[PDB]
Design a protein around this ligand. Sequence first.
Ligand code: MET
Ligand SMILES: [Cl-]
Length: 243
Amino acid sequence: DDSVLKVGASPVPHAEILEHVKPLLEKEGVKLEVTTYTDYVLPNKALESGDIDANYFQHVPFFNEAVKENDYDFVNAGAIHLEPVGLYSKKYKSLQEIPDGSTIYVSSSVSDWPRVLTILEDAGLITLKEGVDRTTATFDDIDKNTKKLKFNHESDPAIMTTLYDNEEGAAVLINSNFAVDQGLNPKKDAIALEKESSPYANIIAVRKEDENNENVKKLVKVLRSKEVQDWITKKWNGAIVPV
Ligand code: MET
Ligand SMILES: [Cl-]
């Protein structure tokens, strides 16, 4: 069954986008089988064990960290979409209202830390030290901390919606895939949104030996086609941004 392509994906939008393109791939002779995963670890582990042939869930900075940490022999088969990341809160309508010494919750995924840092910088609430390596920025790079905010980075990315829902902290950084699955719209519900999300394009990742796989190329080409990208835009109202 070399006509069958097994793809690991996040629930929303990723798995939904995959289900929507299935008929387009079938007209091309490719049988797409989706495995939906609820976390950011098992899709990579599954790709390495051969349980799946590709995955669709992670951005390049995540991917790079994961390849280096795990010695995964993977390749990027191509960028599909962007998820501009939000800070969410049930307490404050704006970051400018947060009392000093309040906690900002972020996940333990280090590759998202520079995103929260750009939002706070744009909001005028922190500055970064001269000679920060902005590609790998962390909380230790903060020079001015205007509202003297604390950052908790212990939680798994998959529980960030619970922290929000339970009113923990002044605000919470939630990846859009989890936000959208719980019924939050980043464009309407977030109190601040990432201004430039292009470094965080979500990719199709595969094993190195499948780097020239014809079924994979067909998947990437269908996911980047104009009809599909317009569909993605209309489905989530611009919260999910096609490349
Ligand atoms: C596993 S890296 C985070 C991926 C998530 N869909 C985002 O773009 O923020
Ligand atoms: Cl690309």
